């Protein structure tokens, strides 16, 4: 089963776990916060979320009530959608390594990782 | 930071992603559904949720409204609670190996995995 509302919760829930892990790093990179001491662990977490994310968009979740994803995600642009997920896993793994190298390599790699959230939202997020 | 409704969506949506992968396999072990063709992939996904789980119970979410976890999870029995996530993660990894081995192996390791959901629930979850 799984009520539609449970399915939207799983999808936004994975997105919220992504944001919790990311924000500390986006903020340091923007000169708005101190260097998260657990940066490498957050970016590893970000890449595990990346790998699971396609479950929140599985068959039957094409038109949940209150969903915010464009239908092209499930159809004509389904492969490019999947491809954004893979890109986030790869940049997040690179972000892990750059956290262990030092604050400046983390800042350069956070810029490349944020682009991926922004690109996919521009193309596929309704709001 | 973070609004508590977003914090709870985090926590609860991780658990919905856990249930969505566990269900078909528990259903099989029970004799109520056929064997999932992707049982192995489901199980590795469960192990990744389990690694990520502790985020949903981070410091600062001890008293989210609408929260369903006993105060002991955050303090007095905090070690025991994080230990359960650990156990889930190794059981779900073993479930993935069993899936590859055959039905009889998956049924038996499924019984084993499900006990960890049960024990955690009996101690730390509210009715
Ligand atoms: C597509 C490949 C995405 C990538 C990469 C990122 N996100 Fe995104 N996110 C995506 C969509 C289609 C949606 C809409 C979901 C729906 O409701 O139907 C979202 C939503 C979010 C949210 C909102 C969750 C909520 O509570 O409603 C946030 C906080 C979010 N996304 C964050 C985020 C960040 C930080 C990313 C980069 C690390 C990122 N997402 C990548 C699609 C995609
Ligand atoms: C502790 C170490 C846990 C293990 C292992 C598992 N669960 Fe659990 N679960 C836990 C708590 C403390 C809670 C309540 C969270 C709160 O404060 O709201 C839950 C909740 C769930 C839910 C409901 C989610 C929702 O929409 O409200 C489900 C569907 C759930 N848990 C499933 C589940 C399964 C299938 C597990 C084994 C594979 C499992 N949980 C393990 C604590 C823990």
Structural commentary:
The structure is a homodimer of 127-residue chains. By secondary structure, the first copy, chain A, is mainly α. Chain A has a single domain, classed as Four Helix Bundle (Hemerythrin (Met), subunit A). Chain A contains 4 helices and no strands. Chain A has helices at 4-30, 39-52, 78-101, 103-124. In chain A, helix 1 runs antiparallel to helix 2 (39-52), helix 1 (4-30) packs antiparallel against helix 4 and helix 3 (78-101) runs antiparallel to helix 4 (103-124). The first copy, chain A, starts with a helix and ends with a helix. At the A-B interface, helix 1 and helix 2 of A face helix 1 and helix 2 of B. Residues 11-12, 15-16, 18-19, 22, 46, 67-69, 73, 81, 84-85, 88, 116-117, 120-121, 124-125 of chain B line the site of one heme C. The site of one heme C has 21 residues of chain A, from helix 1, helix 3 and helix 4.
Short description:
The structure is a homodimer of 127-residue chains. The first copy, chain A, has 127 residues and is an all-alpha fold.
**Which sequence of SSEs, written as H and E, runs from N to C of chain A?**
HHHH
How many E-type strands of chain A?
A: 0
Please tally the helical runs of chain A, counting DSSP H or I stretches of 4 or more residues: 4
Question: What kind of assembly state do the chains in view correspond to?
Answer: homodimer
Which chains make the largest contact? Answer: A-B, 22 and 23 residues
Major sheet summary line of chain A = none
Can you name the CATH architecture of chain A?
Answer: Up-down Bundle
CATH superfamily of chain A: Cytochrome c/b562
Query: What small-molecule ligands were found?
Result: heme C
**How many structural domains of chain A?**
1
Shape of chain A: elongated
What name does the CATH topology of chain A carry?
Answer: Four Helix Bundle (Hemerythrin (Met), subunit A)
């Amino acid at each position: 089963q799984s009520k539609p509302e449970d399915l939207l919760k799983l999808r936004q829930g994975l997105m919220q776990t992504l944001k919790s892990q990311w924000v500390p790093i986006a903020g340091f990179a923007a000169g708005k916060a101190d260097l998260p001491a657990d940066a490498a662990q957050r970016a590893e977490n970000m890449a595990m979320v990346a790998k699971l994310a396609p479950i929140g968009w599985a068959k039957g979740t094409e038109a949940l009530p209150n969903g915010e994803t464009k239908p092209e995600a499930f159809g004509s642009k389904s492969a490019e959608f999947l491809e954004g997920w893979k890109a986030l896993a790869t940049e997040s793994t690179k972000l892990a390594a750059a956290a262990k190298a030092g604050p400046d390599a983390l800042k350069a790699q956070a810029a490349a990782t944020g682009k991926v959230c922004k690109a996919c939202h521009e193309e596929f997020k309704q709001d």
